[PDB]
Amino acid sequence: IIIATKNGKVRGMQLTVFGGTVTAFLGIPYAQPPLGRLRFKKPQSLTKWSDIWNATKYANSCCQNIDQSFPGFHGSEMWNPNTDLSEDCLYLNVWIPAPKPKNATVLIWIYGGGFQTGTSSLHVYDGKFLARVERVIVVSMNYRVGALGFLALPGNPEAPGNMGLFDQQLALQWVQKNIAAFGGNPKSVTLFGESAGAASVSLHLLSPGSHSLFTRAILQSGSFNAPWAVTSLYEARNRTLNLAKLTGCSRENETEIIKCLRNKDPQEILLNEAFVVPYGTPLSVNFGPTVDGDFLTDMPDILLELGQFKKTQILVGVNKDEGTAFLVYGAPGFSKDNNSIITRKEFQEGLKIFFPGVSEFGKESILFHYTDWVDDQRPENYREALGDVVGDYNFICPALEFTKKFSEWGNNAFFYYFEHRSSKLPWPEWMGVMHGYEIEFVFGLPLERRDQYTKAEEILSRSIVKRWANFAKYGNPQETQNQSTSWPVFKSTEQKYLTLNTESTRIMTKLRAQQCRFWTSFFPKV
Ligand SMILES: *[C@@H]1O[C@H](CO[C@@H]2O[C@@H](C)[C@@H](O)[C@@H](O)[C@@H]2O)[C@@H](O[C@@H]2O[C@H](CO)[C@@H](O)[C@H](O)[C@H]2NC(C)=O)[C@H](O)[C@H]1NC(C)=O
Ligand SMILES: *[C@@H]1O[C@H](CO[C@@H]2O[C@@H](C)[C@@H](O)[C@@H](O)[C@@H]2O)[C@@H](O)[C@H](O)[C@H]1NC(C)=O
Ligand SMILES: *[C@@H]1O[C@H](CO[C@@H]2O[C@@H](C)[C@@H](O)[C@@H](O)[C@@H]2O)[C@@H](O)[C@H](O)[C@H]1NC(C)=O
Ligand SMILES: CN(CCc1c[nH]c2ccccc12)CCC1CCCCCC1
Ligand SMILES: CC(=O)N[C@H]1[C@H]([C@H](O)[C@H](O)CO)O[C@@](O)(C(=O)O)C[C@@H]1O
Ligand SMILES: *[C@@H]1O[C@H](CO)[C@@H](O)[C@H](O)[C@H]1NC(C)=O
Ligand SMILES: *[C@@H]1O[C@H](CO)[C@@H](O)[C@H](O)[C@H]1NC(C)=O
Ligand SMILES: *[C@@H]1O[C@H](CO)[C@@H](O)[C@H](O)[C@H]1NC(C)=O
């Protein structure tokens, strides 16, 4: 199977999925490799080729530091890259139904990873099941991460910032120009992503250069207003200059600093990335999105508040235990290999780990609001409070606030609370419904019965896949055939949301109301 694109012919490959066929095009380039003098610059358009490009294997993943905290442990290593790292990584993937559809809705995945890690080739992002089951086209792209994707000397085109977001954008542009050749509908494109990918999707809603490149948006466990998602111009410059000092590249002319960093091996860049901040946390985003005056024309909180974003439907949600995964990356007393019953003193020390630049009063105010116990004698009280602190502050309250503010300008929004812990989850049970572990359900891995998920998880994934596909196709995440709970729109008054679990799917109101009033109204003042 050969498809003529606007830059040349590409060859795909046939997959057998659930007794049917999916055509996969893996590793289509969508930009000039950003190498040599193109490192740190915006992605450049692609010169045509005359041969047949063989898109039959996942391409290189972008340079990035690896999670080496639990060698040999699938719970962490399933997120590490599974193809060679290379600066030559600006490639994308396309899964199309077989037989070739006529005007199929398109789903574009943007992976997360704190804007420092990630790759589209991960097993849990395999789009062949979505294409097979729902006859949508799935596209995913690699984009630059870390300093190579987000280094910023604001205003300087040698390193303007937001390059990895512009990589994402050029890929959406590729889908606009080429996807009809694959049987896709460029007028029916839904972006979806998780964590930093979700924050990325939310910034595409704010960026005027992305408004004509997609229809709708899905935001899984993330949004730009999360406290880790946007770097200020002060810190971005301080971090670029710290990286220059760490590499021997300090110069007076800012452009000569970039030229010096262009001659450094990617490994020297990657090795010094962690130290550009003084106080890291397990959630540090050393190099990430900034207000560059190009992709982002103003501080995104201002754009959100004043209604300056794409008017369309959104689907947004969070997981029950967003915060727990980060506790075993530094909080004292915590371990994935025991039950992590921590004391009050260990709790207080954990706040210092997760809020290092925050005043004593600010840390006490966290302790005061989260340690008013239903039972003082419950031994896991402090262990659970710290997970909820990290989860509510970093993910759940920003997602709820994004959805509130977004829906106030008249658009339909749908909010979910994912509370199913995967039966295959390799992390311990005290970490619950972890950050990142709805993705496999969204992508339909539990539909593969050979893979030891329960039957109840097959059913849950099947229903989630249908709702996601109906949202992309029709702007409405219902499952209309199997007497399913109707998913109501989220309004800023009543704030209804839908719970996703294997027992009973429920309509609830005002998620984490007391906790989020603390984080959204009081804590930003400290
Ligand atoms: C749970 O484990 C943590 C982590 O300790 C490590 O992992 C264990 C599973 C075991 O292999 C230990 O030998 C390892 O050191 C424990 O936290 C440590 O506690 C000791 C004494 O309390 C202290 O000296 C260390 O600094 C702690 N490690 C930290 C803070 O990272 C914790 O006590 C264990 N909790 C339970 C309930 O078993
Ligand atoms: C591109 O691929 C052509 C055909 O490859 C066919 O499919 C792959 C997956 C292998 O199974 C191969 O044995 C098949 O014949 C090649 O003929 C051609 O040389 C390739 N082009 C380049 C530039 O590598
Ligand atoms: C800004 O930068 C100052 C210098 O940072 C120091 O040197 C670099 C190379 C790193 O190793 C870093 O860890 C060092 O602390 C800092 O002193 C300062 O705190 C930074 N931040 C702010 C807000 O000023
Ligand atoms: C050390 N961890 C760095 C990643 C990171 C840095 N900064 C962020 C900001 C938001 C979300 C994630 C990050 C990796 C955390 C992952 C989380 C996914 C589930 C279990 C595996 C462990
Ligand atoms: C150090 C270590 O590997 N410990 C134990 C692991 C992990 O604690 C969990 O899988 C969560 O990471 O779990 C086991 O009990 C299990 O699941 O059979 C085996 C093993 O003794
Ligand atoms: C695909 O659908 C759009 C409307 O969503 C329509 O304008 C376009 O002509 C269609 N293309 C086909 C059917 O090839
Ligand atoms: C910095 O170097 C660049 C590269 O030649 C040059 O164009 C620019 O004018 C220099 N800036 C200053 C202030 O000298
Ligand atoms: C609806 O129910 C049938 C069984 O009656 C099941 O096979 C099918 O997968 C369900 N569809 C969805 C979209 O959940």
Swiss-Prot record:
Tissue expression per record: Detected in blood plasma (at protein level). Present in most cells except erythrocytes.
Keywords from the named record: Disease variant, Disulfide bond, Glycoprotein, Hydrolase, Phosphoprotein, Secreted, Serine esterase, Sialic acid, Signal
Top-tier EC class: hydrolase
Effect seen on changing residue 34 to S: In BCHED; seems to cause reduced expression of the protein
Subcellular location: Secreted
Residue positions where Phosphoserine is found in the record: 195
Mechanisms controlling activity: Inhibited by mercury. Inhibited by Tabun. Tabun forms a covalent adduct with Ser-195 that becomes irreversible upon aging.
PTM field: N-glycosylated. No other PTM detected. The major N-glycan structures are of the complex diantennary type with 1 and 2 N-acetylneuraminic acid molecules (Neu5Ac) making up approximately 33% and 47% of the total N-glycans, respectively. Only low amounts of fucosylated diantennary N-glycans are detected (approximately 2%). Triantennary N-glycans with or without fucose amount to approximately 13%, whereas 5% of the total N-glycans are of the oligomannosidic or hybrid type.
GO molecular function: acetylcholinesterase activity; amyloid-beta binding; catalytic activity; choline binding; cholinesterase activity; enzyme binding; hydrolase activity, acting on ester bonds; identical protein binding
Main location, first listed in the record: secreted
Entry-linked CDD domains: Esterase_lipase (cd00312)
Chain positions recorded as substrate binding sites: 113-114
Residue positions binding tacrine: 79, 435
Effect after changing residue 515 to L: In BCHED; seems to cause reduced expression of the protein
Mutation effect (residue 494 to V): In BCHED; allele J variant
Effect ascribed to mutating residue 195 to G: In BCHED; enzymatically inactive in the plasma
Reported disease: Butyrylcholinesterase deficiency: An autosomal recessive metabolic condition characterized by increased sensitivity to certain anesthetic drugs, including the muscle relaxants succinylcholine or mivacurium. BCHED results in slower hydrolysis of these drugs and, consequently, a prolonged neuromuscular block, leading to apnea. The duration of the prolonged apnea varies significantly depending on the extent of the enzyme deficiency.
Function: Esterase with broad substrate specificity. Contributes to the inactivation of the neurotransmitter acetylcholine. Can degrade neurotoxic organophosphate esters.
Protein name: Cholinesterase
Underlying gene: BCHE
